[PDB]
């Protein structure tokens, strides 16, 4: 009977993956955007007998630091960094954020 | 506990555990990592007959859940952590068709045992009206 | 005495009449300018409970004898004429059927109690 | 309504806005002194759910 | 005939007749002539309530099917007979999308009344078991 | 259940617009023809509530 | 009305009114004028939670359908009346893709509430056979 | 078949009913932009405890203290709609729709179980009356 919960978990968490992809996918043609890659984690439920259930929790391990492909605009002050490079920017609260 | 209720109830417990394992497999198919960081190894249950001393028959016990030791199909993402030399993520080896059939068959067996229990309960409650 | 059954009797009869009214609403879902109806159950039931003269009884062959539709406020005007809202009608019909079943169960249980007292 | 539908909706609206920009930009060839216009987009605040 | 049965069944009959009219229109659109030789006039049904003396409501009656008074859109074929001076054939004025929506709406209303009848049948059969 | 009718209206009216343009359009190379432009009107259904 | 019938029926009625607003907007996209002669101002529905007094929760009320205050996108036609100086027709401000997405969302919410009503109705029938 | 089992199963029925009514409220008020005073609707949950805490032994469930779920209150972005603050963000109640579907599903199943338990105990007790005769 509690199996439904595990299944529910999966369904719910799959929607979260969908959400990520959607935000990951609407953001094409957003300058320098870093795709937020996602994964699903098995979560065992260690208990007092017969460890049989595992949940499907959704996660985003990080961002895809694969350099997106360049558009030539000839504008004098449009900048493209080399691979693994970042421009440092004074964030809203005030701290060195990094952008592409 | 009357013997036949025990037999059918053990069947119910075994079927519930089998269906739970199948659901966990079907849910964590395509799960990169476990807690510590290792593949999710696909899980199976072991059905054995109960009442070992006496009559050699009766009930089903699902002690000792085990793991299906198939070679854990790989994928190639050599930027992902959890990838060894020859970057090869481990990618649980759950066959969805097998697990769906397991769920269907487990539900049907569960129904059969439930409905055996109902039949037997009626049988005994009718036995109580023996004579009077 | 034996008018303790009167309340659920009238409540069940009023539920049946409301069922007929709601079925009429469903049936007339698409006729133009139908202007759907209803009754106020609490008021009708109070009125029936709170409230009949037997005629003259002279020599035989003397022939003894005897014998509020509210408007539901509409949402979503049509200008195809009608004002029956299907969702409201369906929920009201389902609720009315459920409460009719309840009243039937209660009246049957009262009758069972009365009949069980007698043996 | 779930987040996926509306996220994809704002993606569709952004592409529509980009196409509006392009169409205006293309109609205004042979308009003296006109300056081409480039649409620049941005992501929205990320709703964190579970800190690492 | 039981009263609520009468109401819902009258709705069923009216909806069936409306669907039949819609099908006749949708099929006889694109029809040059009748039997005697005249435009085909798109047909419509008229819905009215029933049981006039008493309770002023209850059930739907479909009396007086009529022919629509839309202006009979013309076409030009002055070699085909049936065309008047200034050769013009009469060519029924059926609104196909309106008739499609009529068919779907009538089917949906049919389903609603059908299922209402089934509900009332269950209610009455449980009414028979009052007490006993 | 009445939404369909509104949609129906639009679809039906759109079809009529098509006809207009077709009559508007087959009349190319018709001497002195005056093109008949078309429009769509919102018709509110002002009633009791909502 | 029983409590959950009220909550879910209110959800259904609100979703129906939202769908009607969406259909009206979608149908009047590219509609030059209203009756009085005015841009067709696109419409929106605002969902409040019902049951302000008592438990503060349950059901949805969507009174006061309002006007979406986007800027009435313009087109240039100084031959058409209804254009001011610097001839500009008013041209409704309906976001068609927003309306399609809104239509799908409304349909899905509608169906979810239908489903919850079904489950709860089975529950209630089981309730009434309490004892007898 | 004691009489203090009617109390336990009836309390279970009431708790399941209240949980189901709350979950129906959650599912209905998804995408309810505003509250009556004007506030995003906060999806709620009910807290199940054991009834009659002190001494006792085991018996019954209580649904005291309906609480407010701490999901991160998802946002949307429509800076044309009022009720969107600076950096226009309609606050958009935080309902996990599939979770609420399953909640209603299981609530109905548990309610049905307890209804049945009531009937079975009453049959037990009515056959208790036929003791001797």
Curated annotation (Swiss-Prot), chain A:
The lineage of its organism: Bacteria, Pseudomonadati, Pseudomonadota, Gammaproteobacteria, Enterobacterales. It comes from the Bacteria. It is found in: Bacterial flagellum basal body. The gene is flgF. The basal body constitutes a major portion of the flagellar organelle and consists of five rings (E,L,P,S, and M) mounted on a central rod. The rod consists of about 26 subunits of FlgG in the distal portion, and FlgB, FlgC and FlgF are thought to build up the proximal portion of the rod with about 6 subunits each. Belongs to the flagella basal body rod proteins family. This is Flagellar basal-body rod protein FlgF. It comes from Salmonella typhimurium (strain LT2 / SGSC1412 / ATCC 700720).
Curated annotation (Swiss-Prot), chain D:
The lineage of its organism: Bacteria, Pseudomonadati, Pseudomonadota, Gammaproteobacteria, Enterobacterales. Keywords: Bacterial flagellum. Belongs to the flagella basal body rod proteins family. It comes from Salmonella typhimurium (strain LT2 / SGSC1412 / ATCC 700720). This is Flagellar basal-body rod protein FlgG. The keyword Methyltransferase does not apply. The chain holds residues 1 to 52 of 260 of the full protein. It is found in: Bacterial flagellum basal body. One of its GO terms (biological process) is bacterial-type flagellum-dependent swarming motility. The basal body constitutes a major portion of the flagellar organelle and consists of four rings (L,P,S, and M) mounted on a central rod. The rod consists of about 26 subunits of FlgG in the distal portion, and FlgB, FlgC and FlgF are thought to build up the proximal portion of the rod with about 6 subunits each. One of its GO terms (cellular component) is bacterial-type flagellum.
UniProtKB/Swiss-Prot annotation, chain F:
It is found in: Bacterial flagellum basal body. The basal body constitutes a major portion of the flagellar organelle and consists of five rings (E,L,P,S, and M) mounted on a central rod. The rod consists of about 26 subunits of FlgG in the distal portion, and FlgB, FlgC and FlgF are thought to build up the proximal portion of the rod with about 6 subunits each. Belongs to the flagella basal body rod proteins family. This is Flagellar basal-body rod protein FlgF. It comes from Salmonella typhimurium (strain LT2 / SGSC1412 / ATCC 700720). The chain holds residues 2 to 51 of 251 of the full protein.
UniProtKB/Swiss-Prot annotation, chain H:
InterPro entries: Flag_bb_rod_N, Flagellar_basal_body_rod_CS, Flg_bb/hook_C_dom, FlgC. Pfam families: Flg_bb_rod (PF00460), Flg_bbr_C (PF06429). One of its GO terms (biological process) is bacterial-type flagellum-dependent swarming motility. It is found in: Bacterial flagellum basal body. GO terms for cellular component: bacterial-type flagellum; bacterial-type flagellum basal body, rod. Disulfide bonds: none annotated. Keywords: Bacterial flagellum. Belongs to the flagella basal body rod proteins family. The basal body constitutes a major portion of the flagellar organelle and consists of four rings (L,P,S, and M) mounted on a central rod. The rod consists of about 26 subunits of FlgG in the distal portion, and FlgB, FlgC and FlgF are thought to build up the proximal portion of the rod with about 6 subunits each. This is Flagellar basal-body rod protein FlgC. The lineage of its organism: Bacteria, Pseudomonadati, Pseudomonadota, Gammaproteobacteria, Enterobacterales. The gene is flgC.
């Amino acid at each position: 009977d509690h199996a439904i919960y595990t299944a529910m978990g999966a369904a719910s968490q799959t929607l979260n993956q969908q959400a990520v992809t959607a935000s990951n996918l609407a953001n094409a043609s957003t300058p320098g955007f870093r795709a937020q890659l996602n994964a699903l984690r098995a979560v065992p439920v260690d208990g007092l007998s017969l460890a049989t259930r595992t949940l499907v929790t959704a996660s985003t391990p990080g961002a895809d630091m694969t350099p997106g492909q360049l558009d030539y605009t000839s504008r004098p002050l449009d900048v493209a960094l080399q691979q693994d490079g970042w421009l440092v920017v004074q964030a809203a609260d005030g701290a060195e954020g990094y952008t592409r | 506990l009357l013997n036949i209720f025990d037999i059918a109830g053990s069947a119910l417990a075994a079927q519930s555990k089998r269906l739970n394992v199948a659901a966990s497999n079907l849910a964590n198919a395509d799960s990169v990592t476990g807690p510590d960081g290792q593949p999710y190894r696909a899980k199976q249950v072991v059905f054995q007959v109960d009442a070992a001393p006496g009559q050699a028959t009766g009930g089903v016990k699902v002690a000792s859940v085990i793991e299906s030791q198939a070679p854990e199909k790989l994928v190639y993402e050599p930027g992902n952590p959890l990838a060894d030399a020859n970057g090869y993520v481990k990618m649980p080896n759950v066959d969805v068709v097998g697990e769906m059939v397991n769920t269907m068959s487990a539900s049907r067996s569960y129904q059969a045992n439930i409905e055996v229990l109902n039949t037997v309960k009626s049988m005994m409650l009718k036995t109580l009206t023996l004579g009077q | 005495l034996d008018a303790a059954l009167r309340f659920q009797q009238e409540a069940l009869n009023l539920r049946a009449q409301r069922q007929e009214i709601l079925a009429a609403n469903i049936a007339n879902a698409d006729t133009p300018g139908y202007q759907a109806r209803d009754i106020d159950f609490a008021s009708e039931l109070k009125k029936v409970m709170v409230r009949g003269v037997a005629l003259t009884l002279t020599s035989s062959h003397h022939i003894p004898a005897q014998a509020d539709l509210l408007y539901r406020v509409p949402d979503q005007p049509s200008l195809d004429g009608n004002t029956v809202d299907m969702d409201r009608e369906r929920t009201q019909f389902a609720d009315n059927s459920l409460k009719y079943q309840m009243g039937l169960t209660v009246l049957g249980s009262q009758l069972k109690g009365m009949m069980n007292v007698l043996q | 309504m779930i987040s996926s539908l509306w996220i994809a909706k704002t993606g569709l609206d952004a592409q529509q806005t980009n196409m509006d920009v392009i169409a205006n930009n293309l109609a205004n060839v042979s308009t003296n002194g006109f300056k081409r216009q480039r649409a620049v987009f941005e992501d929205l605040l990320y709703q964190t759910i579970r800190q690492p």
